[PDB]
Symmetry: D2
Subunit: 457 residues, 4 copies
């Protein structure tokens, strides 16, 4: 249909099939498709998700123009995504003025100030993690990181968001953990979403049937569960409180539920998935593991409890986290819908085009990264951290729509790692997939789950 767009504008790209566009090229996943296109075509290129034209861009100035400069004017929203039901009101999903309102109503929740107050509560579930791990370190049986990390990551969420306090690894069947684990980061290469991409005219069909990519049952569990806690604390420290206090243009109650749902997933599969990637890289590079175990003990001698300030003090820890996020940027791509005919850094961009930054492919670009497949934390030494274009390395996005939970996500993940490297070491098992292979699907996740050996220090 609209498959002449890039051929006119003089932008190169893979030739689209009728109806499908270029989607059959996703058979190795977004990341691999993005790398190929980068090499085959250079700095800019175009392709079609069904009839949806997508313009990839790799110029840091141009990227900065889209993500920062012209964000409010032209590139305000992300690719429409449906069917979502009442989740239209989630911040990550909302548009234009509604999003601007929600970003405001929700920003002070994520300050360095409020973040320092969540430390002692986040500190408490680190210790729960250790005990579950030593039960396996004392029973010489290899460990799947995702289960134990997610048990931890969930434990922090439920708490930092509603006060609920479960040992999700040892009380995994209590009514709360059941619903909350039923979140699934959406495989955009799964049967369902490829059908969307080729039949996006079916989203409104599904919307009028109250179908939701968020299971209609988990949402109902928390919609009421919030209006219980809402009326329990009212009247008699967490995200809900910080959002309830805000509605005192102000936030509504079902909007509040929707943000709660986004926050819960946000820090579940993500925090847990990033922790897994770090632990893998640690186990397969044992020296880095040792160098970090030294710094954790120098700043916190005698296995001293990590504090907010001791965490920012640690610099090799930061380097490890960053270099992991370079090799596994869980978002893979950034995207904005171009809402007006515009011209940025010398290129005409018509209305409706989705503009896409290929984060995974830029993190692995040899034109900016020496030995880009190698896990080498020193790239982020304060000697070299200045050489790195913040518009090439973008694991949390950028501009007015970057990751709202970035600080919290780094803090949470580091508090988990300080505590864990104070007590154990991590070894490849025979069953450990080395080298790790990324799922060919639509998520940045390992093909096989990560299994390692855990020895008690």
């Amino acid at each position: 249909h609209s498959h002449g767009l890039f051929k006119k504008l003089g932008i190169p790209g893979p030739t689209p099939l009728p109806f499908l566009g270029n989607i059959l090229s996703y058979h190795k996943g977004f990341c691999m498709f993005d790398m190929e296109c980068h090499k085959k075509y250079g700095k800019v290129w175009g392709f079609y998700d069904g009839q949806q034209p997508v313009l990839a861009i790799t110029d840091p100035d141009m990227i900065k123009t889209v993500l920062v400069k012209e964000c409010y004017s032209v590139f305000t929203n992300r690719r429409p995504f449906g069917p979502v039901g009442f989740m239209k009101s989630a911040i990550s999903i909302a548009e234009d003025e509604e999003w601007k309102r929600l970003r405001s109503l929700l920003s002070p929740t994520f300050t360095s100030g409020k973040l320092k107050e969540m430390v002692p509560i986040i500190a408490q579930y680190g210790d729960v993690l250790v005990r579950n791990l030593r039960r396996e370190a004392e029973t010489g049986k290899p460990v799947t990181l995702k289960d134990v990390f997610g048990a931890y990551s969930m434990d922090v969420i439920t708490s930092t968001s509603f006060g609920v306090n479960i040992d999700s690894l040892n009380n995994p069947q209590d009514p709360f953990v059941e619903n909350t684990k039923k979140l699934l980061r959406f495989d955009f290469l799964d049967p369902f979403f490829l059908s969307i991409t080729v039949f996006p005219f079916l989203i409104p069909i599904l919307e009028v049937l109250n179908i939701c990519v968020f299971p209609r049952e988990v949402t109902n569990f928390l919609r009421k569960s919030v209006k219980r806690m809402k009326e329990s604390r009212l009247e008699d420290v967490d995200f809900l409180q910080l959002m309830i206090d805000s509605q005192n243009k102000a936030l509504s109650d079902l909007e509040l539920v929707a943000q709660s749902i986004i926050f819960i997933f946000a820090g579940y599969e993500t925090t847990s998935s990033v922790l897994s990637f770090i632990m893998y890289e640690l186990a397969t590079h044992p020296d880095v593991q040792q160098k970090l175990q030294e710094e954790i003990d120098a700043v916190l001698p005698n296995k001293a409890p990590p504090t907010y300030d001791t965490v920012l003090q640690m610099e090799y820890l930061d380097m490890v986290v960053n270099e992991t996020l370079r090799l596994f940027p869980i978002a893979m791509r950034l995207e904005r819908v171009c809402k007006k005919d515009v011209e940025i850094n010398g290129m005409f961009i018509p209305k409706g085009v989705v503009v896409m930054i290929p984060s995974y492919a830029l993190h692995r670009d040899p034109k900016y990264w020496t030995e880009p497949e190698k896990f080498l934390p020193e790239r982020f030494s304060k000697k070299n951290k200045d050489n790195i274009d913040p518009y090439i390395y973008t694991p949390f996005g950028s501009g007015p729509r970057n990751c709202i939970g970035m600080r919290f996500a780094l803090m949470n993940m580091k508090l988990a790692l300080i505590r864990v490297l104070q007590n154990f070491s991590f070894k490849p098992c025979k069953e450990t997939q080395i080298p790790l292979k990324l799922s060919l699907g639509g998520l940045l996740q390992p093909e096989k789950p990560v299994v390692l050996k855990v020895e008690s220090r």
Copy 2:
């Protein structure tokens, strides 16, 4: 689904049925439904076209706020209408910045200046009208106005828009008149569009099938026919010329076709339908007919040819046209889609609500019109024309999005009537529907076509 909207906001309205909303109430047509609601509920009210909330308003200040004040800011577009294909680019159909561009690129086409230049060509087809009529005035057989007026109205269009010059009543089968008559003002109460209103999620389905409410065949006839005339005049006075000269941000070629299509219908069924309504009212009020025949002869003695200036000179003619348009405002309603949460003249209007002015019901409101059903031209005497709220009487809309062809449409219609009342008189026949009954459907048209007796002066 969204059927609680007005019940929350505290706006009264007829209770909606699931899925249908209030559409079953259209069984007497928009106009009658609008009158009822006006009386039942007062100054504002709400209802649902399927799941689409519609807020009717009748305050002239509030109407002025929507149609003029906040037009560019909030109320810029009309109710989405599909499937349209390439006709998305027609001015009457286009949105936001695209419309603003098209209104600019097309405005100077409709000036008092360019309009004075179309007079002598529009004058020529008036004489064709007379001859066809006297062939019936000399053959004592009653006449259907729509056929003879449309023959005339078409004759002016084809000319004033492309130079083509046919006697569409006597050369009705030439290739051009066949396609051009295949326009149909859309019965929004017909089977098809009621299905849209209850399944608007099916428009995108139909759009991806290249289905068009404008027959895919007539459009193809003129798409090429334009790019012929385009390349005939280039290189070797009408709307096409005025649009071709404009593309010399500038107008494209298929956009040019689309405007051509809108203009052709615009002045066909409308001009012809309004002429019919005037002739009816004239025949059933013979004194008004006489008073106007006197003024036509005082300004143009000896059946003098009407000129642009002699036309504006005529004031009872104007009164007749206006008072007809009061009783038959062919648009019935005006509408704008509310693009932001706003508050106008003290009422909150949420995003997405269609705001509707019920022109037909306001033209017939006894709270502003004495004996409103009576055809009484003197309402528009220069003694009384000042008493009339331009926000109650709105046959051409208002504000930046009023009828672009208003001046031309009045001129064309008056040039037709001066010539015709200079030569004939018009009498009720036995077959004449008295009093006229409006089609219960979705157009302002007579139930039965208007048949009259035509006697040669």
Copy 3:
């Protein structure tokens, strides 16, 4: 659209709304709508589920013609039901020759012979039920029947179908009980299915998206779980065995899964729901409870273990079960799609019409039942059991497509009750809904769950 059908044929019925047909009348549920129509219109009547014409019939001969006589010829299948995915192959859902094959391949599974072999295994979980109950009979706290019965009913299913052996009330979190409880008898008056009924043209839309009214996750759990047990028993007494042996025109493996799913639900919510209804009626009619506790002890003195033969010996037990099923026939209606133009017992029935028997309304018809709302088991005394038209009383359907699991369902339910009335008695609590109110929705279930007092004999 097709809303003239019954008006032509001369069959009376409620006047249908456009698009909706008569569905708004479901606001009190099928059962109440059926009763009204029966009284308002008499022996036959028509109505529209959207555009779907439905002919209700209440003549026992005519009912026998449809359900038995012309079953194979004309009335072979049930109302199309979608989207179902691979569940198209379930027996209860399948059509024409495929169903005939599946009914054959699955019939010997349900014989009096094989049924006598399942007794000792079904006997074992009765004792599990007692212990869970006395833990509540010794802790003076009222009991919700559905939870304790479903715990039991599940326990029998998992066993009688796959050998799996869980105390689902005390091991409720083991991986098997989680998936298996995620069956939900479909509320055909819920948002989703009313949308089907008005947009049945959307089923094929949903089918091509691999959407399934059976959650795509539970099905995957058992599809593989079967092909595990399949390859565990092969090679090294239950329904799976009886189906695996059958494929040794023969049954396939995914067909086998689908039957497994139908059987699991079939005996879960149903058996458990019917048990609840009996216990309610028992508690609110304490004499019937006593009369039955006497017969259970006469045939099984000293709390003797019930056997297959001792179960059929018990006749007042049968009367209780039957009279409960009269007042709560969980299917509510029977239905067949008329596959040919036919004429049965003097009435023309066009192709495509769904023919419906209103079981609930016939069970409550005063023209066949004295004091029909009264729970009076003696109606089914061997003195009166002969007076009862098997085409008026139809809790298991009739003809070649009656309930395949009828015998098993009666046996299972009676083995549960003999054991339970041998040990406890059942008393109304203050919280007990008396009289019970049927859910206004699309299932025969109580508005409020049934809570009773349980005292240890």
Copy 4:
């Protein structure tokens, strides 16, 4: 989805793309795709029209089994085709018992008896054809066959079906010819129908919107036009009469309209298209033209008027018609939907598979035709006509569902040619496309229309 079908059954075919199946291979049209598959794969093969599995077959016994033997049992209907509206009732479109009824109610209309009675009326419009042609034979200007033949072919239809009698080439604008020319043989490779094939789940969507591949306006013209003529002849020789007499299980009135529509097209574009193909082959093989002009004059000396009997007498005329139909079999393919699991001539054919005979590819198969691209009428000499497998050469189909109008179509076409070769000869013009190229689309029609020189004998 179902794209494993042929890979399992062990049938070879082109590998299908997701969603598209093999449809992209239609870029050279069905005929060319069919030839390739025949050569690449042999006697049987499979492919996918979207998700629709299609099994091509080329064994004459197997073809006879499908088209004749198992027609009523298994292969009764053609590939579902929609949206059709009330045209569901046309015979060529109807299914199962409804079709069997319509074939009966309509068969005696097409007998050798009734056909002999239509001769003198069909004879009359032959003479109209001559005069229009000599007006061009006397004005040395090349002639487009389709216009002049269709003018003739229409003239015979309107007459033989309703008595209406127009000179459609010289009265082409009368109200009847306008609607009747608005039939269009459907380009199944046009945008619309390829969208069906990939979204056949959208047919029911369109059916519920009263959209029709037969324009909703032409159908309305004749629905009423029939019920006028119906009530004009009733009460005060053609197909309508023969159908009206039949309803005196019997035919209804709107069914009657629908058959009328099928018959009108059937003999319009087809008869006219076949005539064009013959005239082309005649002009480009001048000896065949001469040999036939001799036989026409031997049987009809002195330009004697052809009679029914003189027509069957002519044998080289028959040979010409047949050999043309070999090279241009306007149906291209025959098709039946397999309604049951069956096994025919040693191959398993699952339910739902469309079984397709590739007539065009078999007519051009070198394994049955010497020099198959050559136009050589002698193939059909009574010496060689016996060598020809009626299951390889199938321009009118075969079995209970062959072309109902075959005899009439041959008669009509031959009466046209006898008259025309009695008076003119036909010569290539410079503008004549030699060799003719078949439209790459979805019809058997020439790329360019056929233009020839016409000289008066």
